[PDB]
DNA sequence: TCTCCAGGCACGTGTCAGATATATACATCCTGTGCA
DNA sequence: TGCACAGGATGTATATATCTGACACGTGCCTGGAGAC
């Protein structure tokens, strides 16, 4: 009779019932459908996986084993669609990209 | 209860002169109980239960606190080792704001390690000490050691050296230890070099060094005899001697120890 | 065919002579300290001691500080312990080895002052019998 | 009441620190036989007075 | 009691990079990020469901919301991952 | 809405990376002295 | 007046010994997600 959660029923590692709880007492609609928390759980799981993949090779490009928000900031702003998504957000301890305009160099 | 009592009285006599002493004798005759009797008689003299510092290697630190607790349990012992939270607890307890002599306080004797002294120089630069005792001073042989530098920078003004053999002969070590004894007179090493060689080196340290030996008591200790065994290499221990030079230290040392290494 | 244990002993002549003198040292029923210079030297001796199933303990630089208390306590209380694997400067600085007399210096030739501290560790007051310092 | 609570908290902190400092400063057989498994197997016993043959 | 997505985020980087540590500040950055996408998607879906005179939020409403908020490439990857997950969940027969 | 049990939190204990240290011999560089 | 040679000093080079230092894993618990109607 005992069965496991909906997350591994959908094959997901993010909590489906917790997403359903936050949807129901988040006061967005009075009736919440069944397939909506599974869809939202899959979307947020994929976005987290893509973000951690980008932070992963950004941290391998610095020869380290830990993730600093320098790596997160770099992995955000060298990718164009995350640039478009996260344009107006500022990350804690991020800094800026190394850039210099063409005529400002010692051209000679 | 031995002839270390007159030796500690001679140490107190040169203390009354106002200079730091040198123990230049081998371990085995009981310099630990001699030093705790130095502290006990000095406390009997001018009524000081207060700040006393013991700098000691970590393996014999437990031996030191064990013999202190067994022999003279009148004082209150403090260790300085472990994690950072225990370090902060002992920093809460060893608080010695009241200067000079104190009675009802647990900082009577302070035991610690060499590394721990080296790595808490920011906290040990304060808490101006009265009597540091550094046992086994061979690690302050070098004058380039940063531990030697932070041992220089304290505000204790007593630099009694305890070691078994101070005679490691690198010709800078003697100047380094003498510069630790008086900081003030010994600072130029070139004048120490420039100012018959075997005879004139004996009476320089004569008013400071005391001359004792192990062959003065009754010898049931064993009178140790050195039996030396010299043996020959095996063939597997032979051919790597040619192999190592065929491609061309501690390397051949360990091949001598055992081939598998 | 596995690496033979006796072939591991007999291919090293220092270990060969050590195995010869341990036979009479255990036949007399004595107390033995053995010194080494490296970790890998004491990473090989206990395999030889498992052949003899001797009571042996090891103290080195990577040992935790509390274990050095109860190991010395078990040395000065239990008499059935036989082999004392010691580092150069660990057990040779002020450690009470008063009931021991036979020290085995495997490679104690790095500096004479460390060796002087080493044989000041066992040759101490309270020793009831003669001290024989072996040097292979 | 506040002074008594402060004194009790100071006493508790002093007791905990003294216990930690006392614990840090003062405190910081026959081999078993092989297992014998004889399942689904016959048995021959030879005692002093009588013999057995346990079969299936 | 306080809630965090720390263990789930942890196993997410453990499928892709096993020998990789994490900072607590980076974990807080990631938690704020996923919560921000969650509230954006939720308010878009609730606003769209109110706009279509419907009292129920279903999968097609957040489908339109994901088409609306995310840029197109990441949008069709997101809806593809969501459709395989939802069709796998719906096969409880 | 009733029931009910294990998920994930919270809080303990151990294990490979950095930092001073010995250390002796060998090699390189600089300085001084002697010679043309 | 310059150049070369020799001698002395300093630096290097690679396991130890210690030895912390901040990291990852083995147990409680309680409550909220899951099944049933």
XYZ file of C-alpha atoms (C1' of nucleotides) in Angstrom:
727
model
C 0.000 0.000 0.000
C 2.890 2.331 0.805
C 4.147 4.262 -2.215
C 6.751 6.960 -2.747
C 6.238 10.609 -3.693
C 5.157 12.248 -6.935
C 8.680 13.509 -7.682
C 10.186 10.132 -8.570
C 6.853 9.244 -10.165
C 7.745 12.079 -12.536
C 11.442 11.205 -12.195
C 12.380 14.503 -10.534
C 14.680 15.321 -7.616
C 12.901 18.563 -6.646
C 9.963 18.356 -4.181
C 6.651 18.193 -6.044
C 4.401 18.325 -2.972
C 6.286 21.314 -1.565
C 5.755 23.139 -4.876
C 2.066 22.208 -4.617
C 1.969 23.551 -1.033
C 3.604 26.840 -2.059
C 1.191 27.118 -4.985
C -1.891 26.458 -2.861
C -1.148 28.766 0.070
C 0.637 31.280 -2.120
C -2.829 32.722 -2.983
C -2.666 32.771 -6.773
C -5.932 30.987 -7.620
C -8.673 29.335 -5.597
C -8.423 26.072 -7.568
C -5.088 24.498 -8.528
C -4.891 21.669 -11.052
C -3.052 18.390 -10.650
C -0.435 18.618 -13.396
C 0.680 22.175 -12.632
C 3.170 21.487 -9.741
C 4.812 18.701 -11.779
C 5.282 21.038 -14.765
C 6.645 23.832 -12.559
C 8.919 21.376 -10.719
C 10.364 20.154 -14.030
C 10.912 23.728 -15.268
C 12.716 24.879 -12.104
C 14.756 21.651 -11.985
C 15.917 22.153 -15.583
C 16.800 25.813 -14.957
C 18.772 24.909 -11.814
C 20.579 22.126 -13.706
C 21.530 24.491 -16.550
C 22.710 27.185 -14.110
C 24.819 24.679 -12.170
C 26.245 23.286 -15.426
C 27.387 26.797 -16.416
C 28.779 27.413 -12.918
C 30.497 24.036 -13.233
C 32.556 24.736 -16.322
C 33.109 28.318 -15.143
C 34.724 26.895 -12.005
C 36.730 24.300 -13.992
C 38.017 27.265 -16.013
C 39.510 28.654 -12.799
C 41.004 25.302 -11.620
C 39.015 25.091 -8.381
C 36.639 22.737 -6.556
C 34.275 25.300 -4.968
C 31.741 27.731 -6.418
C 32.378 31.427 -5.738
C 29.789 34.018 -6.929
C 32.553 35.243 -9.270
C 31.955 32.006 -11.202
C 28.164 32.457 -11.032
C 28.461 36.069 -12.224
C 30.736 35.043 -15.105
C 28.515 32.098 -16.098
C 25.536 34.460 -16.111
C 26.977 37.278 -18.209
C 28.898 35.246 -20.795
C 25.604 33.604 -21.798
C 23.178 35.741 -23.782
C 19.807 34.307 -22.752
C 20.699 34.445 -19.056
C 21.921 37.968 -19.823
C 18.429 38.745 -21.132
C 16.737 37.009 -18.184
C 18.934 38.461 -15.423
C 19.605 41.934 -16.810
C 18.100 43.947 -13.945
C 19.349 41.753 -11.064
C 22.627 42.364 -9.233
C 24.524 39.408 -7.771
C 26.242 39.630 -4.384
C 30.025 40.052 -4.862
C 30.093 39.736 -8.626
C 32.245 42.436 -10.164
C 32.370 43.256 -13.862
C 33.740 41.783 -17.091
C 37.172 42.707 -18.494
C 36.329 45.036 -21.383
C 37.936 48.046 -23.049
C 36.771 50.041 -26.061
C 38.851 49.820 -29.246
C 40.071 53.421 -29.574
C 41.135 53.601 -25.906
C 44.010 51.158 -26.516
C 47.490 52.539 -27.362
C 46.889 52.088 -31.082
C 49.924 54.111 -32.357
C 66.563 16.318 47.576
C 69.730 16.050 45.475
C 72.575 18.327 44.371
C 70.158 20.126 42.035
C 69.204 22.208 45.095
C 72.582 23.957 45.135
C 72.342 24.287 41.350
C 68.969 26.006 41.648
C 70.401 28.197 44.415
C 73.209 29.142 42.004
C 70.548 29.880 39.370
C 68.757 32.079 41.925
C 72.103 33.760 42.674
C 72.613 34.692 39.023
C 68.950 35.756 38.977
C 69.800 38.059 41.897
C 72.677 39.382 39.795
C 70.072 40.092 37.112
C 70.966 37.971 34.081
C 69.333 35.046 32.289
C 70.817 31.603 32.816
C 71.912 28.742 30.574
C 71.294 25.063 31.267
C 73.901 23.253 29.156
C 73.457 19.759 30.564
C 71.887 16.556 29.294
C 68.382 15.372 30.154
C 68.034 12.512 32.615
C 69.019 14.031 35.956
C 65.649 15.741 36.448
C 65.691 19.319 35.184
C 61.868 19.382 35.205
C 61.621 18.932 38.979
C 64.614 21.287 39.259
C 62.672 23.983 37.385
C 59.474 23.411 39.371
C 61.605 23.742 42.522
C 63.067 26.955 41.053
C 59.505 28.255 40.697
C 58.472 26.985 44.159
C 61.477 28.491 45.978
C 61.224 31.730 43.983
C 57.556 31.880 45.021
C 58.648 31.246 48.616
C 61.118 34.121 48.246
C 59.138 37.040 46.816
C 55.518 35.712 46.973
C 54.670 35.171 43.302
C 51.997 32.650 42.369
C 51.364 34.624 39.204
C 52.309 34.412 35.542
C 54.572 31.539 34.523
C 54.923 30.276 30.949
C 56.149 26.860 29.768
C 57.008 26.415 26.078
C 57.285 22.693 25.439
C 56.857 20.183 22.578
C 53.387 18.685 22.405
C 54.373 15.060 23.059
C 56.080 15.920 26.348
C 53.489 18.588 27.239
C 51.318 15.908 28.825
C 54.371 14.553 30.661
C 55.046 18.098 31.922
C 51.510 18.665 33.234
C 51.512 15.120 34.670
C 54.694 15.661 36.690
C 53.499 19.141 37.715
C 50.227 17.665 39.023
C 51.939 14.719 40.733
C 54.854 16.558 42.352
C 53.653 20.061 43.322
C 49.841 20.298 43.129
C 49.608 23.616 44.991
C 49.308 25.781 41.864
C 46.597 25.843 39.173
C 47.562 24.504 35.756
C 46.389 25.817 32.401
C 46.866 24.067 29.044
C 46.795 25.808 25.682
C 45.922 23.294 22.967
C 42.987 21.937 21.001
C 40.370 23.526 18.776
C 39.418 27.179 18.400
C 36.457 27.005 20.803
C 38.633 25.558 23.575
C 41.189 28.240 22.664
C 38.510 30.901 23.211
C 37.461 29.255 26.504
C 41.061 29.381 27.743
C 41.256 32.962 26.452
C 38.229 33.728 28.626
C 39.859 32.013 31.640
C 43.566 33.033 31.391
C 42.428 36.708 31.552
C 45.160 38.406 33.669
C 44.200 42.129 33.510
C 45.369 42.684 37.141
C 49.167 43.154 36.759
C 51.976 41.972 39.093
C 51.117 39.264 41.632
C 47.728 37.552 41.879
C 46.498 34.827 44.228
C 42.950 33.658 43.381
C 43.306 33.102 39.639
C 43.978 30.019 37.477
C 46.903 31.376 35.401
C 49.617 30.071 37.784
C 51.360 27.887 35.175
C 50.730 28.132 31.432
C 51.710 25.257 29.114
C 51.676 25.440 25.305
C 53.279 24.238 22.063
C 55.878 25.737 19.726
C 53.581 25.933 16.663
C 50.711 27.326 18.737
C 52.985 30.100 20.025
C 54.085 30.763 16.425
C 50.491 30.966 15.124
C 49.004 33.039 17.962
C 51.619 35.791 17.888
C 48.791 38.323 17.491
C 47.336 37.305 20.870
C 50.595 36.459 22.673
C 52.127 39.839 21.803
C 49.806 41.144 24.522
C 49.524 39.570 28.024
C 52.999 40.633 29.142
C 54.626 37.629 30.781
C 56.889 37.269 33.819
C 58.771 33.983 33.312
C 58.804 31.966 30.087
C 60.530 28.581 30.202
C 61.300 26.986 26.836
C 62.338 23.357 27.264
C 64.303 21.595 24.476
C 65.644 24.790 22.890
C 67.363 23.019 19.944
C 64.475 24.163 17.717
C 65.630 27.760 18.356
C 68.980 26.745 16.877
C 68.222 28.749 13.722
C 68.240 32.551 13.715
C 65.990 32.675 10.618
C 63.047 30.919 12.308
C 59.871 32.991 12.578
C 59.172 31.203 15.868
C 62.507 32.599 17.078
C 61.359 36.047 15.901
C 58.078 35.940 17.829
C 59.955 34.559 20.835
C 62.134 37.681 20.615
C 59.146 40.057 20.540
C 57.534 39.162 23.919
C 57.521 41.397 27.014
C 58.628 38.808 29.568
C 62.267 39.972 30.080
C 63.286 36.483 31.261
C 64.807 34.069 28.737
C 65.955 31.007 30.686
C 66.982 28.325 28.170
C 66.353 24.651 28.967
C 67.871 22.082 26.615
C 69.776 18.821 26.739
C 72.471 19.739 24.200
C 72.984 23.361 23.070
C 76.142 22.328 21.243
C 74.791 21.696 17.690
C 77.804 23.878 16.362
C 76.640 25.830 13.306
C 78.562 28.962 14.554
C 75.383 31.069 14.316
C 73.456 29.112 16.979
C 75.694 30.261 19.857
C 75.306 33.905 18.805
C 71.537 33.377 18.474
C 71.139 31.893 21.964
C 73.436 34.520 23.526
C 71.434 37.239 21.758
C 68.323 35.681 23.272
C 69.921 35.724 26.762
C 70.833 39.429 26.677
C 69.042 41.084 23.753
C 70.891 44.321 24.465
C 74.615 43.511 24.314
C 74.606 40.893 21.524
C 73.231 42.240 18.242
C 76.244 42.392 15.872
C 77.304 38.954 14.638
C 80.336 40.185 12.659
C 81.989 41.524 15.821
C 81.181 38.161 17.419
C 83.027 36.456 14.545
C 86.114 38.691 14.601
C 86.358 38.813 18.403
C 94.368 29.398 20.131
C 90.877 28.893 18.711
C 90.106 25.897 20.938
C 91.462 27.469 24.136
C 89.777 30.876 23.808
C 86.283 29.447 23.231
C 86.173 27.659 26.595
C 86.152 30.596 29.026
C 83.651 32.726 27.074
C 80.692 30.679 28.357
C 82.409 29.709 31.640
C 80.507 32.126 33.998
C 77.205 31.076 32.354
C 77.557 27.344 31.642
C 77.605 24.802 34.464
C 79.609 21.591 34.053
C 77.873 18.332 35.016
C 77.943 14.771 33.656
C 76.058 11.481 34.018
C 79.113 9.678 35.461
C 78.775 11.067 38.989
C 75.901 9.044 40.511
C 75.571 5.336 41.268
C 75.183 3.596 37.911
C 72.434 1.015 37.861
C 71.012 2.760 34.771
C 72.931 0.346 32.557
C 76.106 2.141 31.350
C 74.999 1.813 27.744
C 77.218 -0.176 25.375
C 77.066 0.398 21.614
C 76.992 -2.908 19.725
C 77.451 -2.159 16.023
C 76.529 -4.651 13.299
C 77.889 -4.159 9.778
C 76.394 -6.342 7.062
C 76.577 -6.726 3.281
C 74.050 -5.941 0.564
C 71.957 -8.569 -1.154
C 71.994 -8.804 -4.954
C 68.618 -7.051 -5.165
C 70.103 -4.445 -2.854
C 73.192 -4.352 -5.090
C 71.975 -3.791 -8.636
C 69.914 -0.644 -7.953
C 73.158 1.074 -6.900
C 74.228 0.779 -10.545
C 70.669 1.476 -11.775
C 70.426 4.852 -9.980
C 73.715 6.117 -11.433
C 72.870 4.676 -14.865
C 70.143 7.311 -15.257
C 72.607 10.051 -14.254
C 70.802 10.684 -1.521
C 67.773 9.800 0.637
C 66.787 7.805 -2.495
C 69.651 5.312 -2.187
C 69.341 5.625 1.622
C 65.871 4.016 1.483
C 66.874 1.445 -1.189
C 69.480 0.483 1.451
C 66.693 0.369 4.098
C 64.483 -2.048 2.074
C 64.157 -2.471 -1.725
C 60.300 -2.387 -1.713
C 60.366 1.284 -0.630
C 51.655 -16.926 -6.697
C 51.511 -14.181 -4.054
C 54.410 -12.028 -2.793
C 56.107 -14.365 -0.335
C 56.476 -13.087 3.217
C 59.823 -14.815 3.831
C 61.065 -13.533 0.474
C 60.146 -10.036 1.652
C 62.163 -10.541 4.844
C 65.177 -12.236 3.226
C 65.615 -9.770 0.341
C 66.623 -7.049 2.834
C 69.788 -7.836 4.767
C 69.087 -5.330 7.553
C 65.679 -6.948 8.080
C 67.418 -10.338 7.781
C 69.785 -9.578 10.685
C 66.894 -7.972 12.596
C 64.930 -11.230 12.276
C 67.943 -13.172 13.566
C 68.413 -11.025 16.665
C 64.661 -10.894 17.431
C 64.688 -14.700 17.872
C 67.031 -14.560 20.866
C 65.547 -11.247 22.059
C 62.113 -12.886 22.324
C 63.616 -16.130 23.656
C 65.076 -14.157 26.564
C 61.798 -12.240 26.994
C 62.949 -8.629 26.850
C 61.632 -5.122 26.079
C 62.484 -3.650 22.671
C 62.203 -0.141 21.236
C 62.861 0.250 17.499
C 63.604 3.644 15.922
C 63.027 4.708 12.316
C 63.533 7.812 10.173
C 60.643 7.619 7.682
C 56.932 6.842 7.684
C 57.415 4.138 5.045
C 59.977 2.323 7.206
C 57.376 1.953 9.974
C 54.759 1.314 7.291
C 56.586 -1.969 6.565
C 57.655 -3.243 9.998
C 54.191 -4.143 11.336
C 53.670 -6.507 8.391
C 56.756 -8.380 9.609
C 55.391 -8.200 13.164
C 52.112 -9.805 12.060
C 54.154 -12.847 11.002
C 55.437 -13.069 14.579
C 52.035 -11.869 15.980
C 54.017 -9.759 18.443
C 52.460 -7.208 20.760
C 53.558 -3.947 19.140
C 52.499 -0.309 19.168
C 53.603 2.600 16.988
C 54.069 6.287 17.801
C 54.816 8.814 15.077
C 54.207 12.414 14.064
C 50.705 11.901 12.658
C 49.400 10.328 15.874
C 46.799 12.249 17.854
C 48.040 13.859 21.070
C 45.747 11.980 23.483
C 46.938 8.562 22.216
C 50.494 9.387 23.327
C 49.192 9.542 26.908
C 47.503 6.147 27.124
C 50.175 4.436 25.013
C 52.848 5.539 27.516
C 50.482 4.528 30.344
C 50.029 1.060 28.807
C 53.812 0.847 28.384
C 54.497 1.677 32.034
C 51.714 -0.649 33.228
C 51.385 -3.626 30.864
C 54.550 -5.781 30.661
C 53.318 -8.020 27.811
C 53.896 -5.323 25.170
C 57.027 -6.141 23.166
C 57.791 -3.866 20.207
C 57.820 -0.060 20.399
C 57.963 1.605 16.995
C 59.225 5.145 17.589
C 59.948 8.142 15.397
C 63.261 9.992 15.701
C 62.242 13.141 17.573
C 58.826 12.005 18.853
C 59.648 9.421 21.514
C 63.181 10.703 22.028
C 62.285 13.971 23.792
C 61.717 13.457 27.510
C 59.576 10.320 27.214
C 59.893 7.898 30.138
C 61.155 4.578 28.761
C 62.732 3.508 32.051
C 61.763 -0.187 31.939
C 63.274 -0.566 28.441
C 66.934 -1.106 27.580
C 67.218 -2.558 24.046
C 66.929 0.190 21.436
C 67.277 -0.749 17.762
C 68.502 2.173 15.678
C 67.612 1.160 12.123
C 68.880 4.316 10.394
C 69.555 6.809 13.224
C 72.479 8.566 11.540
C 70.913 11.847 10.352
C 72.438 13.997 13.121
C 74.180 12.919 16.365
C 72.164 15.317 18.546
C 68.852 13.658 17.654
C 70.481 10.292 18.444
C 71.741 11.738 21.740
C 68.200 12.800 22.622
C 67.041 9.350 21.470
C 69.232 7.357 23.841
C 68.569 9.852 26.605
C 64.907 8.692 26.379
C 65.455 5.080 27.494
C 68.720 5.298 29.475
C 67.078 7.028 32.430
C 66.875 6.616 36.197
C 64.752 3.697 37.355
C 66.169 1.175 34.877
C 66.845 -2.030 36.803
C 69.111 -3.830 34.301
C 71.870 -3.306 31.752
C 71.319 -1.254 28.588
C 72.537 -2.577 25.227
C 72.285 -0.057 22.374
C 72.243 -1.901 19.045
C 73.166 -0.148 15.790
C 72.701 -2.150 12.588
C 15.957 39.061 40.135
C 18.057 40.131 37.153
C 21.246 40.163 39.241
C 20.501 36.674 40.593
C 19.868 35.391 37.056
C 23.105 37.029 35.869
C 25.016 35.410 38.745
C 23.452 32.016 37.960
C 24.342 32.369 34.264
C 27.905 33.376 35.193
C 28.159 30.353 37.508
C 26.855 28.039 34.762
C 29.310 29.496 32.229
C 32.183 29.175 34.720
C 31.217 25.560 35.478
C 31.004 24.673 31.766
C 34.332 26.369 30.992
C 36.018 24.736 34.001
C 34.680 21.320 32.958
C 35.980 21.873 29.411
C 39.393 23.040 30.661
C 39.628 20.088 33.056
C 38.632 17.592 30.352
C 41.098 19.021 27.818
C 44.035 19.243 30.226
C 43.613 15.846 31.901
C 42.059 13.747 29.116
C 43.165 15.398 25.844
C 41.802 -10.363 24.417
C 41.109 -13.810 22.966
C 40.405 -13.953 19.235
C 37.086 -15.663 18.395
C 36.904 -18.968 16.585
C 35.939 -19.483 12.964
C 32.210 -19.951 12.264
C 31.185 -23.577 11.753
C 28.271 -23.995 9.329
C 27.080 -27.552 8.651
C 23.571 -27.241 7.199
C 21.803 -30.028 5.313
C 24.622 -32.458 6.113
C 24.846 -35.804 7.896
C 26.678 -36.394 11.168
C 28.833 -39.091 12.777
C 29.356 -38.839 16.541
C 31.721 -41.125 18.462
C 31.310 -40.747 22.224
C 32.989 -42.823 24.937
C 29.973 -45.096 25.410
C 27.857 -44.949 22.241
C 28.116 -44.030 18.563
C 25.606 -42.166 16.404
C 24.818 -41.817 12.709
C 22.451 -38.919 12.019
C 21.299 -39.263 8.405
C 18.420 -37.958 6.306
C 12.021 25.716 11.389
C 13.152 27.301 8.130
C 12.952 25.959 4.591
C 15.695 25.797 1.977
C 16.206 24.035 -1.353
C 19.731 23.050 -0.314
C 19.606 19.244 -0.558
C 17.826 19.227 -3.920
C 20.289 21.780 -5.334
C 23.067 19.615 -3.860
C 21.996 16.442 -5.666
C 21.446 18.503 -8.856
C 25.114 19.483 -8.952
C 26.084 15.939 -7.854
C 24.647 14.415 -11.039
C 26.642 16.829 -13.198
C 29.805 17.474 -11.129
C 30.588 15.031 -8.283
C 33.913 16.568 -7.179
C 32.579 20.079 -6.634
C 32.050 22.000 -3.408
C 29.572 24.816 -2.849
C 29.566 28.090 -0.917
C 26.759 29.069 1.442
C 26.601 32.497 -0.221
C 26.276 30.759 -3.603
C 23.509 28.587 -2.129
C 21.648 31.719 -1.001
C 22.138 33.238 -4.484
C 20.679 30.090 -6.058
C 17.767 29.963 -3.581
C 16.859 33.595 -4.299
C 17.128 32.836 -8.033
C 14.765 29.829 -8.027
C 12.313 31.649 -5.735
C 12.322 34.647 -8.100
C 11.571 32.479 -11.163
C 8.873 30.744 -9.086
C 7.103 33.969 -8.109
C 7.406 35.374 -11.649
C 5.909 32.224 -13.203
C 3.200 32.044 -10.523
C 2.097 35.668 -10.926
C 2.131 35.305 -14.729
C -0.028 32.171 -14.525
C -2.443 33.704 -12.000
C -2.742 36.881 -14.078
C -3.358 34.863 -17.263
C -5.931 32.643 -15.528
C -7.732 35.745 -14.264
C -7.569 37.171 -17.799
C -9.321 34.147 -19.329
C -12.210 34.200 -16.783
C -11.125 30.827 -15.395
C -10.916 29.823 -11.733
C -8.471 26.942 -12.314
C -4.718 27.000 -12.916
C -3.686 24.028 -15.066
C -0.603 22.925 -16.985
C -1.486 24.882 -20.134
C -1.567 28.163 -18.185
C 2.008 27.788 -16.940
C 2.831 26.475 -20.420
C 1.756 29.835 -21.853
C 3.545 31.587 -18.970
C 6.817 29.754 -19.721
C 6.402 30.643 -23.412
C 5.893 34.254 -22.302
C 8.630 34.792 -19.709
C 11.579 32.698 -20.932
C 13.392 33.511 -24.193
C 12.585 31.142 -27.030
C 15.478 28.662 -27.030
C 15.392 28.099 -23.262
C 11.607 28.270 -23.600
C 11.321 25.233 -25.859
C 13.903 23.308 -23.841
C 11.897 24.118 -20.688
C 8.565 23.063 -22.185
C 10.188 19.927 -23.635
C 11.533 18.882 -20.221
C 8.179 19.714 -18.663
C 6.228 17.734 -21.263
C 8.346 14.587 -20.850
C 8.056 14.891 -17.055
C 4.278 15.495 -17.133
C 3.626 12.666 -19.610
C 5.773 10.372 -17.458
C 3.799 11.410 -14.358
C 0.431 10.961 -16.098
C 1.174 7.310 -16.992
C -0.133 6.001 -13.654
C -2.107 3.185 -15.259
C -10.885 16.031 6.610
C -8.720 11.884 9.261
C -4.728 9.099 9.792
C 0.296 8.091 10.053
C 5.005 7.318 9.198
C 9.685 8.597 7.038
C 12.304 13.287 4.747
C 14.975 16.447 5.807
C 16.182 19.056 8.797
C 19.728 19.862 13.087
C 23.672 18.562 15.476
C 27.498 15.622 16.656
C 32.312 13.507 14.938
C 36.802 12.011 11.375
C 40.410 13.122 6.826
C 43.351 14.877 3.070
C 45.522 20.114 1.872
C 48.785 24.143 3.468
C 52.870 26.135 6.597
C 57.333 26.078 9.508
C 61.369 23.074 9.891
C 65.457 20.148 9.777
C 69.529 19.422 6.540
C 73.339 18.390 3.985
C 75.544 18.606 -0.021
C 76.094 20.625 -4.424
C 76.257 24.347 -7.564
C 76.350 29.090 -8.922
C 77.629 33.807 -8.302
C 80.317 37.446 -6.535
C 84.393 39.428 -4.692
C 89.200 39.723 -3.856
C 93.844 39.018 -5.117
C 97.566 38.302 -8.155
C 99.645 38.632 -12.497
C 100.843 40.462 -17.074
C 95.114 49.058 -15.497
C 92.621 45.269 -16.609
C 91.541 40.289 -16.491
C 91.296 35.752 -14.773
C 91.142 32.445 -11.214
C 90.050 30.837 -6.780
C 87.511 30.841 -2.631
C 83.661 31.666 0.136
C 78.951 32.310 0.798
C 74.323 31.753 -0.328
C 70.666 29.455 -2.397
C 68.446 25.443 -3.879
C 66.199 20.917 -3.648
C 63.258 17.548 -2.225
C 61.067 13.651 2.041
C 60.428 14.052 6.701
C 58.168 15.719 11.230
C 54.440 18.031 13.150
C 50.343 19.711 12.857
C 46.565 22.622 12.488
C 42.580 23.651 9.184
C 38.365 23.602 7.112
C 36.003 20.262 4.844
C 32.695 15.789 4.497
C 29.719 11.643 6.938
C 27.003 8.729 11.116
C 22.501 9.379 14.454
C 17.665 11.839 16.471
C 12.571 13.708 15.393
C 8.546 15.577 14.045
C 5.670 17.084 11.116
C 3.781 17.461 6.840
C 3.075 14.949 2.532
C 0.596 10.867 1.048
C -3.331 7.466 1.036
C -8.450 6.932 1.753
C -13.226 8.727 1.596
